[PDB]
Every structure is written in structure tokens, then in C-alpha cells.
């Protein structure tokens, strides 16, 4: 999202003299000249290569009407031109121009922007300068005088038996320009060529979720079909697998239409880079996966889809807590399938026919009740019972519980069971991503116990003091807890830029700036020079803020609550809404001191600025010493001693005068 | 707890001219004018809308006795009045007054406060000003001249065929005032309307504990009655459940008489807000809970009471350690009930009648000894044995121990047992809120081992030095441990307000301020300007504090212990109680230097202030340069060289003079 003049202009654009043209009034520039104007064709900035696109000061020649009003007139008119204006170049000649302007209008709907494409040729038609006439200096040196537009595409002689090509690329090249330059101040689409899907579109995320679901389906269902050797003849499961496979094929195809993430920048949507990137990084595995026992068991490599893109959805919420139990279930299922395979291999009696009284299948058949019969060895536990028993055994082993009604008995089973035990140990160690959330809970427990210890030890080490003080401390600590629960206001603002931290400080206050009728005529410059300095205090009842105990060093305002100002054990000031106390500093440069015992009534909020950071801003913004030095209504200055008369002493002092 | 003039005055009060009246002597104010006096009825602050309630300076008219001493006399008398004094308003007229004052006395028992309610009407009786007499400017413009009291309640013409209503609301409105304004400086009750229970009353906490106990009762006892299908015909358990239900109904009713917690502020005790709050948030669940198998099993939703208010009592002490074992017991009981239900469903033989030789009930009956008999299938393990066996099995599974004498054998039991294993894994992971307290213990272990490593590695990296130095270091480290165990004095004081941190600093010292006879005539302004700067050091024997190795930059006092002052290997100064050393700075502005080798005798405590922070305070408190510059008794200044005579050299030097 930008004014779109250089994000993709440094790569495909060509020689030009790109202007800005963005409302103007005064003189009128050309600014930077692109793709071949570093230091060999024109002047530098702060000059006619930064300003003054009116053909002038690139002059160094004679005043001809043929050289003055050719392009200098039809610049802000933009229809079509080939006129030859004079703009001095390296060859020191009365340069004469061919071009093909291309018009465009604006984005802000104000007739602001124009494409402003130049070509700036000299040699092609006539150089007629006569600084030195030593034969071939201007007649046959025609091919050596200028190195600019000629050195862009066609570096040979302008005629060179190819006059048409040379004079049809510098007279009219709008065919290769126009849409080839990034159009206007239109906030550009985030680098999206046609028929490419952005990797943060609402479509791609749904596609990823669908492929994840199908990956879990295949990981769950393939080993079960491999081990239990169920008869394949069916209807529903016969066609669903083909649908799943074709979905993965569609995913492989569609992976060439998605944006590739850049190395630290933003999206890279090059139609060529994406293809080689994918082919190099992850095409072989998906090719093998989505193509007999080996053929149907190699399909497990589809888990690369989950492994590769795991970062997108690891923390959509409380998802790791589900991921761990999911991998637990999958490893349990795989080990159960292997266990049933071993059990089925052990029985069948290792050739001949004599039931092994050892392998756990015989024991399961004996315990359930259904025995083995010989017809040729048919009849036994049903398929569902076999699978659930295998899963139950693997669950007993992996959770490190162990029951023993189903347990290894033969030799091979014992070689398997030790490896299964070690893998289960490692995995049960791995499970503790959940005791992280449990650790947040138990850490809250420790923090509460810590605050309890803090309170008790503080109270004891105090050598004991009047309990009112401890009560005040406890109330203040719990209060400061319950408007600032966990996250502070300081560390948050120290990880910010200077300007965005100023933004945070300016929209934090918003209650004297946008509510008090003094901050009106300041858009963003005075306020952000001040709003970074108002600190908001949450007052507490009974507090002495600027009592006869300190020196006045801060203007204060009230936004929520009321402040009490004692004047030697007697009162006139209880403040209301938007009421100021404290000495004025904008026309005084004079100091006041401790002449009050100001108390606090409610749970108030004050806005306080130190003296040092207030005078500086108003000094710099001296023009704002008019709107913030006459619109402040002084409620009660702590500078002049207020005046206020007893109704219960004058009566009695006049009474005491008649008796004496 | 406040002077109670605006906490609930901005919402229900009406137009008035609220005064302060809080002892006075000098001139006598009116201060702020409420509910309709922003900028359209009177002047601004620092004026007769901040001071001078004597009717004056709001004058702009002629001196009539009818306009001078109507309300200006009967202001500090407060009996009853309708007199028409002159107070200039927007309409530029000799304003004439109707009011009804309401009297009140004080809170401090000194005849201080008065309610001071005004009405300030102009138009009603007679405006007789003649600035412009163009027909209807004062005769029919009567309804447009003033926008103040008329724009409060009755905005129409004073007569408007409703003279009684208009002239009975601005002549006497004490019926709608008085108790409708927050009364006096009486420290107000914490916003308690009648017949509402505060959520921190000693009653509500007991109610919460009782409902928690009954919730645990019902959660324990309902599933047992659901599963074991015990005969309901009884006496004690027949009526107790009804009592429990009526207690929950009483709780539902009483939940509309409790204070609702505010969004970050303090209690909200609005009789209307509480009702809708509760009804929206948690009424439906409690309605369903406290209304056949479904009817008696839906009662478990009473756990919302425990879940909702869990924050109040999570850390009354070591309570999480009990909460975890409680939830462990409850989940064990629920799973045991489900297990017994499955076991009882399996036997009964799934229609027909032939005992299943698989389900664990048959195995339990065989192992205990009591078999099953057919009469129709009656006789077996007793109810208590059945329940305890189910609980034992669920405990074996949940603690991941596993024994195997009672183990799943059938099919359904194995489908249940795997889900039970996974849930047990998650819950046993969750249990570690206890290894938090164990973590405090084991963290103490690590900290001790850390200090051991610290000591050893320091000693070795020292490249070895005389062992006395290491002994001093070790003693100092353990000493600084054993008066500052864990909690410091710095981080505690950096989370404090400026004033409350000053409070902590002022009552930390208390041993020269309240014990030395120099800090007497300073209430809270001088001391808190100094007490923030005395830092207390705990001295160590043998230490050289201000020896001939540094420059004197701090006054010091002794509070506990004694200091030794060497004068070139000979002594006169060993200090006692409240004894000062160091050069004086209040009448010198002169510097001293290293002229001693002052040692340390006991484990002493000194109070030290840097030079920079002592001269400033006494300069500002120049009037206190009289009570703290003549009441300090100089024990031994490190400024003048002390004088003290050998008794073992003069004798011997006179001896050596007779032999030479």
C-alpha cells in the first residue's frame, strides 16, 4: 500500500524522466530521471534534474523558437508529441527531442498524476554544434557524441541499415510503456499477478485444514488395512480412497498457484520462482506419496504436509493441548497394529499346525471364552475384539500403567516390548507440553503464595508500626493490582518506535485533549509534543498531593473526581470537572511554595506534567501560547491566598467586643 | 470515605449553587454552581462564582434596598426565605429571587456545614429592565430572557395556565431536596442502599462456604444414588435432600440482594443493575439445576456456583493443595460409578439368563468367595464391597499404578478403559500444582547449592588471598542474609507513590527523629523533606568508615552502638547514644578532610545523608535553620583537631631532661 513508484520499477521499467506532479503552486519540477541518468546525461538534484521541468537552465545554446517552445509548451497538455525541444546533454549540442507521451489522470480524483515518460534522444536527427570542426567531429562522430537513450536498447548507429527499428523505438514506444509502469497512487494490490492464490487467502487456509483432516484420516486408516488384512471387497471404502488420492493430486497441482513466502520481506509472487522453489524443496516426497503391501504402506509419507506447514496453526488457540493427544493416539494405533501383526505371526504355529500355547492370541481367546477350532485353523476372537484388545494393550504400555492380563509371553514379543517401553518412556517425557498450561495454573498458585509471603514478611520486618499504615499499604497494593493486572504501561511503551509510542501517549489521555475546552486548535503537532508528557495518576482518598510538604513543580488537571484544598484548617476549594490547580507559568516565570494542605476525597484521576517539560513546548510553540494561554479558566491557583470569611467568629468577636 | 459532595451528586442532584462553608476567616465564598451554571448564568472561577457569595459584583444595576439586603442578609442565618435579592444574569436585568433553603449543621461538631441550596429564578415575578423598549422585549419576551432555572424542569411560560405548578417548584422545593443530596462530611457508608448485602460482609462469605459444602455433598452423593440404584425408601436421606434443595432456592433468591462488583471501580449497589446482571449472566443454569433418572442427574450443574466464585477463596492459605486432591477424589468417584454401571450391565447376561464368565463382577464374586445363585439371579457381593472395589479399581487406574487383580476382560470394558487411561494421563499431568510447593522447597535447595558454588568459585578465582579476607566476606554475606532474608528495601520502595514512599522512608527511621532531642518542631514538612534521605547502614566491627582514606561528605549520627575515632594511633572519641561526628555545614560552607582513622567497635547502626541533599533542604527550610542549628549538640566534630595529653611521655620526657 503506497504511492507505487519504485517497488517494481527498478526491475522492468526503462529510461525515462519520471515526474511527481502532485498539486503544486509555485515553479514546477521534473525530479528524478530513471534508468540511465545517474551522472552522464543531466545535472544533479536541487537543479533542473530535481526542479524546473520547463526546458531551461539545460540551455547552454542559442535562443531559437524551434528550440524553446517544442516540448516546454505541450508538457501539461499531454496529447501526443514528437517535438524537438532543447535540453543540454553531454555532447554539448542544441539537443533535439523525439518522444511519445502516455497520459493518465489520478487516484485522488483531482487531475493530479500523469505518467510523464520521456526518451531524450539527441543524435538521431540533427546535431549542428560547431565547437570544433576538425572533419569527423559532428558528421561521422555522430555515433560517439551521446551516451544516453542510444545506450538503452539499440546501441548502434541510428541509421545502420535498420532505420525503421531505430526510429520506431525512440519516436513511439507507448506500446512497450503505459501498463508496464506501476500505474498511479492507487494503493496497489499486494503483488498479485493473475491466477495466483495468496497464501493468506480465505481459500488457502480452508484447503490446508481439509488436507490436514485427510492426512489424519489416511494415517489412521492405512496401517489398520495393512495389518488386519481385512478383505478389500467393499463399496464405500472402495471409492473413498480414490477420492482422497485425487484430492491430494489436486493439491499437488494447486501448489504451483500459491504465493511463496519471501526471505524476511513480504510475499514473492513470481510465476517462475514459486515453481522451482517448490520443485526443489518438497516435490519428490509428494510425488512418491501420491502414486501390493509396499505400495499401500509407503503412503504414510503424506505427513510431510502436516510437518511442513505446522507454524500456521500451532497457536490458533489452545491447539498444542490437542496436538499432543493426537500424536499420542496415532502412535498408540501404530504400535497396536504392529503388536497384532506379531501376535498373528506367532500363532499359525510357525509351519505345521499346532497352536502355540504361549502367544497372547491364544490367551486372549481362552480368557474371552471363544476357543480355536480346527476344520483349516478357523474361528476365534472377532475382528473388532482383536483390534480393541491390541489398542488396550498398547495404551497400557504407553501410559506406563500396566495391568498384566494381556502381557508378552513368547520370545519375539519380549524383544518388541523392550523397544516399545523405551519409546514409550521418551514419548511420556515429551507429553509435558500440557504441564505448560498446568504450569501457568500452578505458577498463579506460586505468585499468590509469593504475595502472601511478601505481605507477612514486610509486616514483621517493619518492627511493627501502627496497623493503619499496613492497612493503607495492603489496600494500595490490591488496588494497583486491580487496574493493572499483569501487563504494565512502561514495558509496553519501551518496545515502540518514537512516533508510535507518541501515538500511544497521545491517544491514552484523550480526556483533557478531547474533553477540556482548551485543546482544540492543535491537530497533531502541539499535542504530540505535549501528550507524551502528561502522566495520569490514580489518586486515593485522604492523600496529600501538593500539601505544605513539597514545592510546586507541576500543573495538574482533574478529569474524574474531586480534590480538596485546605487553607490552614479551613476550606474553599473542592474541585469539579476540568478544574485546574497549581501556579501558572506561561506569563509568570515565578514560583510558588507550600501554602496548603490539599487532601483527596474520592478515587480521583489527575493529569500531571513536570515543570521542565511544559515551558519548553510552549516556548517552541509560541504561536500556540495564544490558544492555550487565554482559553484556560483558572479554577483555583495555588499562587494567590484565597479570601473567605467566618460566619461563626465575626458574630462572636463582635459579641466579645460589647462585653470588654 | 470522603467529604461526600460529588460521588453521587452528578446523577440525581438538580440546579443549585453548592457552597463549601468549612471554617473561613476573611471574605466568604460560594464556589461552584451545579447543574446548569457552566457558562450561561454566571461568571467564572476566581470570581463571584468561586468567591464572594455576598450578593455583589453580580450587580450591574441600581442600588435599591429591595435589591441589596434580601438574601445577602439571611444567608448565614438559614431559617426560611423567599426574598428577592439582585444577582445579575444573562438577561441583563435587576434579577429577583425565589428559593427555599434547607438547613443542616456539621459532622465535626463545630457548626461548619450547611446544605446551601439555591434556585435562582428571574422571569417569574418581575423583570423591569429598560435597555430596549421595542414593544415585546420585556413584556412578552418574558419567556426568552433567561435560560437557567426555567430550563431545568419546567421550560414553559411561568403562568402558562399552570401557575401553581411553576410557582410551587421555584418557591419551595425542599420536598425534592434535603436527603436527595449527599448529606455532610460524614464519612459515607460504602454505597449501601437499604436491604442490600455487601459482597464482603461476614454473612456472604459464610453463605458461600455453606453452599460450597453442600455442592461437594451433592456432587459426591448424586452419582452414587444414580448408579448403585439403592432403594429410595428411607427417612434421613429422604428429607435431607429437600432441605438442600430449599437452601439452594434461598440462595437463588438471595442472589438478588447482593452487591455486584464494578468494572474496575468499587461496589455497584444499584437495586436495578444487579438484577439484570445476574439474570443475564447466571440465572438460567441455576434455574435448571434447582428444579426420573434425568431429573436427578441434571442436578450436577450446581458446580457453577463453585466455578464462578473460585477467585475469592483460592488463596485463603494453602488451599490449592486441597483443591487438587478434592477434584482427584471427585473424578475418581465419578469414574467408579460409571465402571460399576458398566459391570452391572454386562452381567444380567444380555437377555436370557447365563452368567458371563468374563465381566469383572463374576471375577470379583469368585475371588471374594461369595458366588452367584439362581432362585431370579440374586445373591452376590454386598453393596459396600461393590462400591469399594469400584473405587479401588478407579484409583489404580488414575494414579497410574495398576495391580491387575481387577482388570477389564470383556469388550465394552476395554473401550471404556482406553478413554479412562487418556483422561487419567491428562489429569495426572494436571496434578502438579502440588509440585509447585515442592518446587518452592526444591528451589530453596537449588539456592543453597548456588550460594555454595558462589563461595567456592569466588575463593578459587581470587587466585587465593589471605584467608582473613575470605572469612570477612563470608561473615558479611551471611550477616546481610540474616536481617534481609529475601525481601529487600529497594524494590519494595520503587513500587510506591512518591508520597507513600516518603511515608515509608519517614517511618523507617524513627530513632533520631523521635528519639534524638533535635527533631521536635517539624510536623510533616521538614522531616519528610529530610527523612527520604537518611540511609541507615548496619556497621561492622573493625571497619574504617571515614578514615584517612576518603573525603568527608556526610553528616552521621549513632543510634545503636559505638564508634571509635583514632587520632594518629591514639584515641579520644568513643561515641555513645545520639552522638554526632562529621563537619558541620549549616554555618560553615567549609570543608574538612582525612584527619582520622575511625574504627568500628560493635555491630553499630548509623544514619548517613549525602552533603548535596542536606544543604538544599535547610536552605529551603531556612526557618528550620533555627531549631536544627542550635539544638544539635556536637559530640566530636571531625573538623577541629582534638587535644589530649600523654601521662606516660611527659613524665618520661621530664625524666630524660634531667639526665641530659
Length of chain B: 660
Cα separation, B302 vs B211, whole angstroms: 10
- The Cα–Cα gap between B178 and A476 comes to 35
- Nearest 10 degrees: Cα torsion A142, A145, A149, A152: 90
Sign of torsion over alpha carbons A118, A119, A122, A125: negative
Q: What 3-state DSSP class applies to B600?
A: strand
Between vectors from CA A434 to CA A431 and to CA A439, what angle results, nearest 5°? 125
Residue of B nearest to A386 (CA): B411
- In angstroms, the first-to-last Cα distance of chain A is 90
Contact B15, B35 (CB under 8 A): yes
Residue list for the binding site of B for a nucleoside 3',5'-cyclic phosphate: 518-635
Write the DSSP symbol of residue A377: E
Report the C-alpha gap between A87 and A96 in whole angstroms: 7
C-alpha span between A343 and A365 (Å, rounded): 12
- 3-state SS, one letter per residue, for A422-455: HHHHHHHHHCCHHHHHHHHHHHHHHHHHHHHHHH
Q: Which residue of B5, B437, B495 is in closest CB contact with A574? A: B5
Name beta bridge partners: B563. Answer: B600
Give the C-alpha separation, A638 to A591, whole Å: 10
What is the side-by-side strand order in the sheet with B605-610? B535-538, B605-610, B554-560, B580-581
Distances (CA, A) of A27 to A42, B186, B289: 19, 74, 82
Pairing of strands B605-610, B571-574: unpaired
| Structure determination technique employed | cryo-EM
* CB–CB contact A452 B418 (8 Å): no
Side-chain-facing half-sphere of A375: CA atoms under 13 Å: 5
For the CA atoms of A215, A221, A225, A230, the dihedral, rounded to the nearest 10 degrees, stands at: -140
Residue B156 DSSP label = S
Q: Which helix (H) or strand (E) holds B557?
A: strand B554-560
- CA angle (B302 as vertex; B296, B308 as ends), nearest 5: 165
Residues tagged in the binding site annotation of A? 518-635
Q: In 10 A of CB A462, how many CB atoms?
A: 14
| Secondary structure (DSSP) of A114-169 | ---------SSS-----S--SSTTSSSGGGTS--SSTTTS--S-SSTT-HHHHHTT
Residue B314 in grid coordinates: 483460592
Residue B564 has phi, psi (to 5 degrees) of: -110, 135
Q: Name residues 131-170 of chain A within 8 A of B (Cβ).
A: none
> How far is C-alpha A537 from the chain's CA centre?
32
Contacts of A201 (CB under 8 A, 6+ apart): none
Size of interface A-B (CB pairs under 8 A): 215
* C-alpha to C-alpha distances, A73 to A68, A86, A118, B470, nearest whole angstrom: 9, 12, 15, 92
User: Do the beta carbons of residue A123 and residue A151 sit within 8 Å?
Assistant: no
All three cell numbers of B155 = 421550560
Query: What is the full DSSP assignment across B19-62?
Result: ---B---SS-------SS-SSSSS--TTTTTTS--SS-SS--S-
Strand order in the sheet with A554-560: A535-538, A605-610, A554-560, A580-581
Using CA atoms, how far apart are residues A397 and A422, in angstroms rounded to an integer?
10
Q: Which of A352, A583, A612, A480 is nearest to B264 (CA)?
A: A480
DSSP one-letter string for B212-275: HHHHHHHHHHHHHHHHS------SHHHHHHHHHHHHHHHHHHHTTSBPBPPSSSS-B--TTHHH
Q: Can you tell me the distance from the alpha carbon of B249 to that of B192, in angstroms, rounded to the nearest whole number?
A: 25
* Angstrom distances, CA of residue B185 to CA of A469, B2, B5, B19, B113: 23, 7, 8, 13, 8
Is B40 in CB contact (< 8 Å) with chain A? no
Within 10 A of B498 (CB to CB), how many other CB atoms are there?
Answer: 11
The span from the CA of B21 to the CA of B9, in Å, is: 18
Q: Which three cell numbers stand for residue A205?
A: 487456509
Report how far apart, in Å, the C-alpha atoms of B276 and of each of A654, B80, B194, B280, B420 are. Answer: 60, 43, 19, 6, 41
**Cβ B182 vs Cβ B8: under 8 Å:** yes
C-alpha cell at A320: 498444542
Cell of A356: 502355540
- Chain A nearest-CA distance from B511, in A, is 12
DSSP for A622-654, please give it: GGGGTTSSSS---SB-TTS------SSSHHHHH
Using a CB–CB cutoff of 8 Å, tell me whether A250 touches chain B: no
Chain A: residue whose CA lies nearest to B524: A549
Which residues make Cβ contacts (< 8 Å) with residue B142, sequence separation at least 6? B123, B127, B157, B158
Element (H, E) at B605: strand B605-610
User: Which strands sit side by side in the sheet containing B563-566, from one edge to the other?
Assistant: B571-574, B563-566, B599-600
> Looking at CA atoms only, how far is residue B625 from chain A in angstroms?
16
CA A526-A532-A534 angle, 5° bins: 100
How far CA A125 is from CA of A62, A83, A167, B223, in Å, comes to 18, 12, 10, 103
- Contact present, B259 and B195 (Cβ < 8 Å): no
Cell numbers standing for residue A264: 524476511
Contact B402 A402 (CB under 8 A): yes
- Testing the interface with B: which of A644, A646, A652 to mutate, by most B Cβ within 10 A? A644
Largest Cα separation within chain B, whole Å, is: 140
Residue for grid cell 533542473: A48
DSSP state, residue B629:
S
The three-state secondary structure class of A537 is strand
CA dist., res. A436 & res. B46, Å (int): 62
- Concatenated DSSP letters for B92-105? -S------------
Q: What are the φ/ψ torsions at residue A550 (nearest 5 degrees)?
A: -145, -165
Q: How far apart are CA A605 and CA A614, in angstroms?
A: 20
- Interface mutation target, options B8, B27, B38, B45, chain A, most CBs of A under 10 Å: B45
Of the partner residues A385, A434, A544, the one whose CB lies closest to the CB of residue B499: A544
Smallest Cβ–Cβ distance between A548 and the set B44, B422, B525 belongs to B525
Residue A46, Cβ density class (10 Å: 0-12 exposed, 13-18 middle, ≥19 buried):
exposed
Residue with cell string 442565618: B77
Instruction: Confirm if B56 and B71 have CB atoms less than 8 A apart.
Output: no
Question: 3-state secondary structure string, A294-348?
Answer: HHHHHHHHHHHHHHHCCCCCCCCCCCHHHHHHHHHHHHHHHHHHHHHHHHHHHCC
Do residues B436 and A443 make contact, with C-beta atoms less than 8 angstroms apart? Answer: yes
User: Which is nearest to B47 in space by CA: B82, B88, B4, B81?
Assistant: B88
* Interchain contact B536–A (C-beta under 8 A): no
> What are the Cα distances from residue A87, in Å, to A56, A226, A483, B491?
7, 82, 69, 72
Q: How far is CA A631 from the centre of its chain?
A: 42
For B446, the enclosing helix (H) or strand (E) is helix B433-461
CB contact at 8 A, B84 and B93: no
| A494 DSSP 8-state letter | G
What is the C-alpha separation between B247 and B250, in angstroms, rounded? Answer: 5
Tell which residue, A13, A14, A51, A11, has the closest CA to residue A32. Answer: A51
Task: Compare CB distances from A549 to B21, B425, B524 and report the shortest one's residue.
Answer: B524
Tell me the three-class secondary structure of A35-61, residue by residue. Answer: CCCCCCCCCCCCCCCCCCCCCCCCCCC
What is the number of residues in chain A?
660
Give B166's DSSP letter: H
Window 355-394 of B, Cβ < 8 Å to A: 357-358
Give yes or no for a contact between A302 and A218, defined as CB atoms under 8 angstroms apart.
yes
For chain A, the maximum distance between any two Cα atoms, rounded to a whole number of angstroms, is 140
Amino acid at each position: 500500500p503506497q504511492n507505487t513508484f519504485l517497488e517494481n520499477i527498478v526491475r522492468r521499467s526503462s529510461e525515462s524522466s519520471f515526474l511527481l506532479g502532485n498539486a503544486q503552486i509555485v515553479d514546477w519540477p521534473v525530479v528524478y530521471s530513471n534508468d540511465g541518468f545517474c551522472k552522464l546525461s543531466g545535472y544533479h538534484r536541487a537543479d533542473v534534474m530535481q526542479k524546473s521541468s520547463t526546458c531551461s537552465f539545460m540551455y547552454g545554446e542559442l535562443t531559437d523558437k524551434k528550440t524553446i517552445e517544442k516540448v516546454r509548451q505541450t508538457f501539461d497538455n499531454y496529447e501526443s508529441n514528437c517535438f524537438e525541444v532543447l535540453l543540454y546533454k553531454k555532447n554539448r549540442t542544441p539537443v533535439w527531442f523525439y518522444m511519445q507521451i502516455a497520459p493518465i489522470r489520478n487516484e485522488h480524483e483531482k487531475v493530479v498524476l500523469f505518467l510523464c515518460t520521456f526518451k531524450d534522444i539527441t543524435l538521431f536527427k540533427q546535431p549542428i554544434e560547431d565547437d570544433s570542426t576538425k572533419g569527423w567531429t559532428k558528421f561521422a562522430r555522430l555515433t560517439r557524441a551521446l551516451t544516453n537513450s542510444r545506450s538503452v536498447l539499440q546501441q548502434l548507429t541510428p541509421m545502420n541499415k535498420t532505420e525503421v527499428v531505430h526510429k520506431h523505438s525512440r519516436l513511439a514506444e507507448v506500446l512497450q510503456l503505459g501498463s508496464d509502469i506501476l500505474p498511479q497512487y492507487k494503493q496497489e494490490a499486494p503483488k498479485t499477478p493473475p491466477h495466483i492464490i495468496l497464501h493468506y487467502c480465505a481459500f488457502k487456509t480452508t484447503w490446508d485444514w481439509v488436507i490436514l483432516i485427510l492426512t489424519f484420516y489416511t494415517a489412521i486408516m492405512v496401517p489398520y488395512n495393512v495389518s488386519f488384512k481385512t478383505k478389500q471387497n467393499n463399496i464405500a471404502w472402495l471409492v473413498l480412497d480414490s477420492v482422497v488420492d485425487v484430492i491430494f493430486l489436486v493439491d499437488i497441482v494447486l501448489n504451483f498457484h500459491t504465493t511463496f513466502v519471501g526471505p524476511g520481506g513480504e510475499v514473492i509472487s513470481d510465476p517462475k520462482l514459486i515453481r522451482m522453489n517448490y520443485l526443489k524443496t518438497w516435490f519428490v516426497i509428494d510425488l512418491l506419496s501420491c502414486l501390493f503391501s509396499s505400495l499401500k504402506v509407503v503412503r504414510l509419507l503424506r505427513l510431510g504436509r502436516v510437518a511442513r506447514k505446522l507454524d500456521h496453526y500451532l497457536e490458533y488457540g489452545a491447539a498444542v493441548l490437542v496436538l499432543l493427544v493426537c500424536v499420542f493416539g496415532l502412535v498408540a494405533h501404530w504400535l497396536a497394529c504392529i503388536w497384532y501383526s506379531i501376535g498373528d505371526y506367532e500363532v499359525i504355529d510357525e509351519v505345521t499346525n499346532t497352536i502355540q500355547i504361549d502367544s497372547w492370541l491364544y490367551q486372549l481367546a481362552l480368557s474371552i471364552g471363544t476357543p480355536y477350532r480346527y476344520n483349516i485353523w478357523e474361528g476365534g476372537p472377532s475382528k473388532d475384539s482383536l483390534y480393541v484388545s491390541s489398542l488396550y494393550f498398547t495404551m497400557t504400555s504407553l501410559t506406563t500403567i500396566g495391568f498384566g492380563n494381556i502381557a508378552p509371553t513368547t520370545d519375539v514379543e519380549k524383544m518388541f516390548s523392550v523397544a516399545m517401553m523405551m519409546v514409550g518412556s521418551l514419548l511420556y517425557a515429551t507429553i509435558f507440553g500440557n504441564v505448560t498450561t498446568i504450569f501457568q495454573q500452578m505458577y498463579a498458585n506460586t505468585n499468590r503464595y509469593h504475595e502472601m509471603l511478601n505481605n507477612v514478611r514486610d509486616f514483621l520486618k517493619l518492627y511493627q508500626v501502627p496497623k493503619g499504615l499496613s492497612e493503607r499499604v495492603m489496600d494500595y497494593i490490591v488496588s494497583t493490582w486491580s487496574m493493572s493486572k499483569g501487563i504494565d504501561t512502561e514495558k509496553v511503551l519501551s518496545i515502540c518506535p518514537k512516533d508510535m509510542r507518541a501515538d500511544i501517549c497521545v491517544h491514552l489521555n484523550r480526556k483533557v485533549f478531547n474533553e477540556h475546552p482548551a485543546f482544540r486548535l492543535a491537530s497533531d503537532g502541539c499535542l504530540r509534543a505535549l501528550a507524551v508528557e502528561f502522566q495520569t495518576i490514580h489518586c486515593a482518598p485522604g492523600d496529600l498531593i501538593y500539601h505544605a510538604g513539597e514545592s510546586v513543580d507541576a500543573l495538574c488537571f482533574v478529569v474524574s473526581g474531586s480534590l480538596e484544598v485546605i487553607q490552614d484548617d479551613e476550606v474553599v476549594a473542592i474541585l469539579g470537572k476540568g478544574d485546574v490547580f497549581g501556579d501558572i507559568f506561561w506569563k509568570e516565570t515565578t514560583l510558588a511554595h507550600a501554602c496548603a494542605n490539599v487532601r483527596a476525597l474520592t478515587y480521583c484521576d489527575l493529569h500531571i506534567i513536570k515543570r521542565e517539560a511544559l515551558l519548553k513546548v510552549l516556548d517552541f510553540y509560541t504561536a500556540f501560547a495564544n490558544s492555550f494561554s487565554r482559553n484556560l479558566t483558572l479554577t483555583c491557583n495555588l499562587r494567590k491566598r484565597i479570601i473567605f470569611r467566618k460566619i461563626s467568629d465575626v458574630k462572636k468577636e463582635e459579641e466579645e467586643r460589647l462585653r470588654q
